[PDB]
């Protein structure tokens, strides 16, 4: 049994494509064996996410891996909702119901709803980033109505990178208007990294401000240039390194090669080359519940053209999804269980804070408690 | 660099068992899956069986119930058995490791050692 | 199952050729095929990989090609140390068959 699959890497995921490489031979099995066909092509450029699209159709695969950009999460859902073909993802969570949509990235607006209601604010500063849609804007806006709070809201993607010096500066002087002492970041791990450093140069992390970044990935960032500044952060981490399977694929991947695998030869991890890791171990055990359940969908390179009038989609790619929703394992997320969607349910957030010494987790959170 | 190199017994009698012994150099085994294959004289190179990194283990279609494979991480070697060996079994016997570079790929062989079963 | 094969047995060339080696398959591979080196001591070491790549290591004289169920790997000048044999390998259905294998031979 030999089960293609297709893949869209962007251009420059080299960690994400080493994580990939070892789920791939850490998760081989006897019953089957998966055949990537990887394309390291532009994310954003919705012509060759089409292109990469077609091409993996081509091929004639069950499921295809990949990442989407805001710009293009709505050709991805109809392009997968049309041909009812599978799409596994660590990207961000759509808003709506889209089927064939399985996802890896946990929401995260709940989570931070509950930590300005357990931090009691009533005036803050949101600096936010456009580049994974709207969604927790739009949920922090509704619920700022709701319980009378005074929310800045202020983009920051729309800066270019040739004169973010200036910008800033007057960015962070119109913030001193309401003498702001409360800034949530929501940024990916480029733009993070960025805000700190002007934060660091301009002087406002001394004691007295609170900032907390809104990211999966809160130690994948520096955290050793605001740890001793007096400036208490807070944020959301999906990785627990303290449990016993986190620090045993650790311990493997630190010793890795870094000519062999890039961006391998670090103490952490980013957290979409773990959910990429755990999204491989979730399809590797629907495969093999589909070899455990003697279902034959077995078929040939012959799937035609992807842009067929009328696209006839065939039946039995229909229990795959139905296959997706069946999984229920433990990865370095934790607990990865799925709904009828495609989200993921019964998870654990760890809520950490920056101390002197480090990281300290001071709770964590789920959806039903 | 990686090296491998097999070993066994070298002349073996006939519906006896056969041991080979594969010493792997310059990488983990704990972290890569192992592939043992074999190359009969004049006719096309055969694979045998495979282990993965995790603890599983499959076979060939036709000498399934005859193959079987043990590793030791903490000296780097693999230990193939090979049972019910047949007077056409003067062959040799070789060792890979596996890995993911967009194709299953066989990274680092084994010179292999020749096998000549005979009474 | 899935069976390679290899026209040509032996090829002769001199030094500073480019030399191919043909492969054949008995369908579709996608690609998912890897050329390799064995010396006459008994060392294989890997060439080629996806049948359009080279491994971190080998020579920047070689190359590879191909679609479909034929696949290339062609030399642009052969030396001294590529006297060997080169074998193609196919992973996409278990059992990997591996291909026959060419012998290369110098020309006098």
């Known amino acids: 049994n030999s089960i293609q699959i297709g893949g869209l890497f962007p251009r420059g995921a080299d960690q994400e494509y080493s994580a990939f490489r070892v789920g791939m031979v850490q998760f081989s099995t006897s019953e089957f064996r998966l055949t990537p066909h990887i394309d390291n092509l532009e994310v954003a450029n919705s012509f060759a996410v089409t292109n990469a699209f077609c091409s993996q159709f081509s091929r004639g695969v069950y499921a295809i891996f990949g990442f989407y950009d805001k710009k293009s999460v709505n050709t991805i859902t109809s392009f997968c909702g049309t041909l009812h073909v599978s799409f596994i993802t660590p990207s961000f969570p759509t808003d709506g119901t889209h089927p064939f949509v399985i996802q890896m990235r946990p929401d995260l607006k709940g989570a931070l709803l509950s930590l300005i209601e357990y931090y009691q604010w009533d005036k803050f500063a949101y600096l936010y980033d456009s580049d994974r849609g709207l969604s927790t804007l739009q949920a922090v806006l509704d619920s700022a109505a709701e319980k009378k709070w005074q929310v800045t809201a202020i983009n920051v993607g729309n800066i270019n990178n040739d004169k973010k010096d200036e910008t800033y500066r007057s960015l962070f002087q119109d913030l001193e208007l309401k003498k702001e002492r409360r800034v949530i970041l929501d940024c990916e791990r480029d733009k993070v990294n960025d805000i700190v450093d002007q934060v660091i140069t301009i002087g406002k992390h001394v004691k007295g401000y609170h900032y907390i970044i809104a990211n999966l990935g809160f130690t994948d960032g520096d955290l050793l240039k605001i740890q001793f500044g007096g400036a208490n952060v807070s944020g959301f981490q999906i990785v627990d390194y303290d449990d016993s399977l986190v620090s045993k694929f650790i311990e493997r991947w630190s010793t890795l090669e870094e000519k062999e695998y890039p961006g391998a030869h670090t103490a952490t991890i980013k957290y979409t080359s773990a959910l990429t890791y755990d999204a491989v171990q979730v399809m590797t055990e629907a495969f093999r519940n589909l070899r455990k359940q003697r279902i034959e969908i077995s078929r040939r390179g012959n799937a035609g053209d992807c842009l067929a009038n009328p696209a006839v989609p065939w039946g039995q790619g229909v229990e795959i999804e139905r296959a997706l929703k069946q999984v229920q394992v433990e990865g370095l997320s934790g607990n990865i269980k799925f709904d009828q969607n495609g989200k993921r349910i019964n998870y654990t957030i760890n809520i950490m804070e920056l101390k002197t010494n480090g990281p300290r987790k001071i709770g964590y959170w789920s959806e039903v408690d | 660099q990686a090296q491998l190199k097999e070993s066994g017994p070298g002349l073996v009698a006939p519906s006896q068992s056969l041991s080979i012994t594969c010493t792997v150099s310059?990488?983990?085994?704990?972290?890569?899956?192992v592939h043992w294959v074999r190359q009969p004289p004049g006719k096309g190179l055969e694979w045998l069986g495979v282990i993965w990194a995790g603890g599983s283990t499959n076979y060939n279609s036709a000498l399934m119930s005859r193959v079987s494979i043990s590793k030791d991480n903490s000296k780097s070697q693999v230990f193939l058995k090979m049972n019910s060996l047949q007077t056409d079994d003067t062959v040799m016997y070789y060792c890979?490791?596996?890995?993911?570079?967009?194709?299953?790929?066989?990274?680092?062989w084994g010179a292999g050692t020749t096998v000549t079963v005979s009474s | 199952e899935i069976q390679m094969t290899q026209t040509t047995s032996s090829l002769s060339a001199s030094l500073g050729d480019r030399v191919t080696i043909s492969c054949r398959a008995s369908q579709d591979i996608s690609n998912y095929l890897s050329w390799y080196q064995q010396k006459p001591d008994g060392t294989v070491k890997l060439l080629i990989y996806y049948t359009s790549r080279l491994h971190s290591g080998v020579p920047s004289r070689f190359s590879g090609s191909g679609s479909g169920i034929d696949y290339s790997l062609t030399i642009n000048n052969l030396e001294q140390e590529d006297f060997a044999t080169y074998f193609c390998q196919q992973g996409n259905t278990l059992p990997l068959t591996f291909g026959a294998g060419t012998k290369l031979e110098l020309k006098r």
């Open positions: 310059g990488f983990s085994l704990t972290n890569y899956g």
């Open positions: 890979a490791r596996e890995d993911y570079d967009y194709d299953w790929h066989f990274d680092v």
